[PDB]
Design a protein around this ligand. Structure first.
Ligand SMILES: CCCCCCCCCCCCCCCCCC(=O)OC[C@H](COP(=O)(O)OC[C@H](N)C(=O)O)OC(=O)CCCCCCCCCCCCCCCCC
Ligand SMILES: CCc1cccc([C@@H](O)CO)c1
Lengths: 600, 58, 58, 117, 57
């Protein structure tokens, strides 16, 4: 039965197993028989033998393998997968690699263990997706992610069955993607992940030179560098960015070539592949500035090639286009304000245009229509605020044409919205570097939370006070509403204190009034010193960080606005004949020069 | 708050009208006490943590 | 009149003339919000570069 | 306010079989990097039977290292579990009960006639 | 920046102290587990809290 066999395997006794072998052969019952598999988990004898081992070696697994090859059911016995939701698809090879035992791993591989088996149980799903350990869903990924270089070397280089290290998950992740996924920012994790990433990339280059393992992309379309950028793994991202291979046989993998280096200064050609993509490929800059919400982005944009690339973009097409944008929008808004103010006072829509001033107003109106249709087409092909401003302009023009006199309301509302869109709701860099409203973080939606606590506190205090006021008719709730209004008037301005006429005891009323006023003043001081404290306390490293994020966002928006041909025209870097490639032709890859200084 | 409301109840049972005032004062403290519930909110947290009690005693 | 309402000595005789009260009210309340924000940022800068002077400085 | 010895006591592990009952952090299962550890909740959660280290830590500790000790994994995860299990529900129930009681008190004082003495 | 954790801990402990002792034990955290044999030889039934962690070294 199951319990006796499991106990015998656990204790490691071989005589009882050898005595049970004739029973197995006579009953024509294979180890894989449903009677011997655990019901809840689908577990077989062999994974149990692997789990409980003493001193690293026991004869139980070899005896089971001999028994299974004698019954001739070894191929099914080895690839028996766990079936419960907690452990789905796990194979004996996964457990053998798991327990850090190399000799069992090689024994199973020699016997014919499946090397591409995928374990996609809930235990193995990513930690976010209700999981525990996302090792890459593959035995080679399991060996790589558990820091077992010998197991990786054996699986990738063995005669019995060669592990295909270009294999992909059910999720599409490669072994490099798994290494990126398990990576953290601590020292030992980053250390061994980077070392094994280099090992695997070099090995894949050696085995079949043409393909680069980094070229294989996840089902989401993310390369290992892209995946590190999106997820926010600073260590592996940094290592991939400045990967330099000293070996001359495979130097195509390296990205940070060294042109020259005398003393501290190092002049390095950083490969710009997948960074300044120019629209042919997804850009690590785009993912980093837009998608990645991790605070590590602040450090992720701090790597030398990215920072220098952003600075070069700003120098080439960042400042000039930003100034053109702000000047053009301010001029358009000035024209809109002049048109709105100088709308003809007397008449019915539409209004005739007779004099030159009327023609100037019509020119302003058609300029407004141009801006509105431009924004409409830009968002439709979705900045919500610009879309609302454009649709308001369009409906205002429609009302003007149709004869409705309500054109003045929507048009002025669009005026206010357009002015606030440039000045108040800044998508990227502020119109003025020195801006009066730049420091505040208050929002129109947020203001309601600020006002609501005041309203509740005041209405509670007034509800307390009207009851004392009732003796003085006064008992009606209308008197309650009147005292609410009177108390709001009193707290906003002097009110002659007529209510003390109603009160029997004016001294307690005075005490309550003064304590309420001082409590309101203290609450105001707190809810306004919060912003002042953030202004004098949080600009130490955050102000420059948020400025860098805004500046990057503006640069990327301007960069995306350009057409493809002009985008390639303003491409940073230069073609470099970095070296002889494997095929025998020179390698031409876009590179960016970085003169990094390190003081020893 | 509870001492004030019991004092007001004792005055009301005694037949002293002054109870309303004492009773009213208690109610005021009851509204101030509700801020303990608002201690978590970030906006009024800094006010509910130490202002409402220590600052009220001072 | 606009300055008077910003200070507090204004009267809501402005709302009687306008054809569309609702949009006028919305614009005025937003204008008070932005004017309050401007004055608050002015006072924030004032206090910040006032406390920039410190005991060692003074 | 002694963080190091506090961490050592709350995470104590001893290997000797004779005196292995003094441990407080018992490993239960492991899978390569990940592993589950059962911390012992002795004086960390007494359910009011005796003083609880958490209560002394939040109230009685006046040191600046209170947040570091509250960040110790057993205490932090215990607080998170307490919040998850009944913290939010009971907090909102208390908020609603106070608010309704205060409204009732405001109404009863208001409608009070106070006719004469 | 640090007060919020402490204040939430205060909120939760007050709410948990407001409960009666039987209600306190009803919502206990963790489960009994047989950690091992004691000095006298009897198993130790200790209320334990499970925390999952990683070690890469
Ligand atoms: C008189 C010429 C009127 C041209 C109308 C075109 C126009 O105004 O488009 C305006 C747009 C870009 O402006 P924006 O998105 O508000 O930029 C500021 C940004 N939101 C920020 O906060 O920074 O797009 C432009 O700026 C269009 C550039 C046209 C250049 C003509 C010279
Ligand atoms: C050239 C100025 C400009 C106009 C419209 C949109 C943008 C960017 O927001 C594209 O997303 C820029």
């Amino acid at each position: 039965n199951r319990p006796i066999l499991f106990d015998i395997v656990s204790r490691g006794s071989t005589a009882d197993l050898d005595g049970l072998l004739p029973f197995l052969l006579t009953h024509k019952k294979r180890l894989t028989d449903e009677e011997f598999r655990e019901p809840s988990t689908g577990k077989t004898c062999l994974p149990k033998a692997l789990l409980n081992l003493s001193n690293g070696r026991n004869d139980t697994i070899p005896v089971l393998l001999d028994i299974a090859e004698r019954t001739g059911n070894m191929r099914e016995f080895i690839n028996s997968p766990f079936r419960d939701i907690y452990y789905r698809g796990q194979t004996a090879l996964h457990i053998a690699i798991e327990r850090r035992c190399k000799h069992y791993v090689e024994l199973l591989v020699a016997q014919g263990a499946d090397v591409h088996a995928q374990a996609r149980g809930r235990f193995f799903q990513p930690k976010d997706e209700g999981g525990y350990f996302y090792f890459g869903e593959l035995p080679l990924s399991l060996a790589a992610c558990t820091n077992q270089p010998h197991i990786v070397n054996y699986l990738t280089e063995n005669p019995h069955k060669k592990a295909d290290m270009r294999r992909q998950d059910s999720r599409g992740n490669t072994v490099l993607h798994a290494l990126v996924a398990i990576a953290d920012n601590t020292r030992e994790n980053t250390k061994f992940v980077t070392k094994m990433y280099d090992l695997l990339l070099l090995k894949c280059a050696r085995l079949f030179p043409d393909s680069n393992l980094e070229a294989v992309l996840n089902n989401d379309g993310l390369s290992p560098l892209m995946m590190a950028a999106k997820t926010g793994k600073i260590g592996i991202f940094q290592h991939i960015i400045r990967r330099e291979v000293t070996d001359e046989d495979t130097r195509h993998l390296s990205r940070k070539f060294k042109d020259w280096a005398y003393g501290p200064v190092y002049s390095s050609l950083y490969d710009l592949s997948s960074l300044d993509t120019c629209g042919e490929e997804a850009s690590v800059l785009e993912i980093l500035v837009y998608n990645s919400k991790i605070e590590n982005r602040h450090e992720m944009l701090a790597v030398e090639p990215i920072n220098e690339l952003l600075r070069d973009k700003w120098r080439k097409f960042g400042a000039v286009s930003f100034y053109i944008n702000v000047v053009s929008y301010l001029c358009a808004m000035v024209i809109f304000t002049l048109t709105a103010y100088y709308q003809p006072l007397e008449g019915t829509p539409p209004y005739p245009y007779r004099t030159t001033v009327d023609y100037l107003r019509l020119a302003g109106e058609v300029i407004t229509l141009f801006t509105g249709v431009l924004f409409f087409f830009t968002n439709i092909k979705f900045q919500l605020l610009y879309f609302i401003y454009s649709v308001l302009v369009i409906v205002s023009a429609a009302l003007y044409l149709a004869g409705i006199e309500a054109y003045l309301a929507v048009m002025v509302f669009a005026l206010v919205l357009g002015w606030m869109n440039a000045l108040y709701f800044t998508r990227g860099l502020k119109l003025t570097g020195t801006y009066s409203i730049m420091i505040q973080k208050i929002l129109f939606k947020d203001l309601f939370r600020f006002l609501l606590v005041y309203l509740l506190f005041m209405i509670g205090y007034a509800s307390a006070l009207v009851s004392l006021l009732n003796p003085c008719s006064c008992r009606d709730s209308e008197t309650f509403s009147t005292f609410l209004l009177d108390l709001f008037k009193l707290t906003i301005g002097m009110g002659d204190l007529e209510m003390l006429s109603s009160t029997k005891y004016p001294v307690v009323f005075i005490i309550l009034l003064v304590t309420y006023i001082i409590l309101t003043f203290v609450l105001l001081l707190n809810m306004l010193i919060a912003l002042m404290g953030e202004t004098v306390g949080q600009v130490s490293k955050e102000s420059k960080h948020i400025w860098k994020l805004q500046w990057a966002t503006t640069i990327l928006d301007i960069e995306r606005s350009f057409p493809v041909f002009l985008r390639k025209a303003f491409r940073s870097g230069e073609m470099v004949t970095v070296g002889k490639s494997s095929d025998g032709t020179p390698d031409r890859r876009w590179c960016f020069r970085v003169d990094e200084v390190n003081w020893s």
